Amino acid sequence: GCVXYPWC
C-alpha cells in the first residue's frame, strides 16, 4: 500500500 498516499 501507499501510506500517506491513498491515491496510489
Swiss-Prot record:
GO MF annotation list: ion channel regulator activity; toxin activity
Residues bearing the modification Cysteine amide: C8
GO cellular component assignments: extracellular region
UniProt keyword list: Amidation, D-amino acid, Disulfide bond, Hydroxylation, Ion channel impairing toxin, Neurotoxin, Secreted, Toxin
Signal peptide (UniProt feature, chain positions): none
D-leucine PTM sites in chain numbering: X4
Localization in the cell: Secreted
InterPro entries in alphabetical order: Contryphan_CS
Modified residues (4-hydroxyproline): P6
Predominant place of localization: secreted
Keyword Lipid metabolism among UniProt keywords: no
Tissue specificity field: Expressed by the venom duct.
Cross-referenced PROSITE patterns: CONTRYPHAN
Highest taxon of source: Eukaryota
Disulphide-bonded residues: C2-C8
Other notes: Exists in two forms, due to cis-trans isomerization at 5-Tyr-Pro-6.
Family: Belongs to the O2 superfamily. Contryphan family.
Primary role: Its target is unknown, but this toxin may modulate voltage-activated calcium channels (Cav) or calcium-dependent potassium channels (KCa).
Swiss-Prot/TrEMBL domain comment: The cysteine framework is C-C.
Protein name listed in UniProt: Contryphan-In
Species name: Conus inscriptus
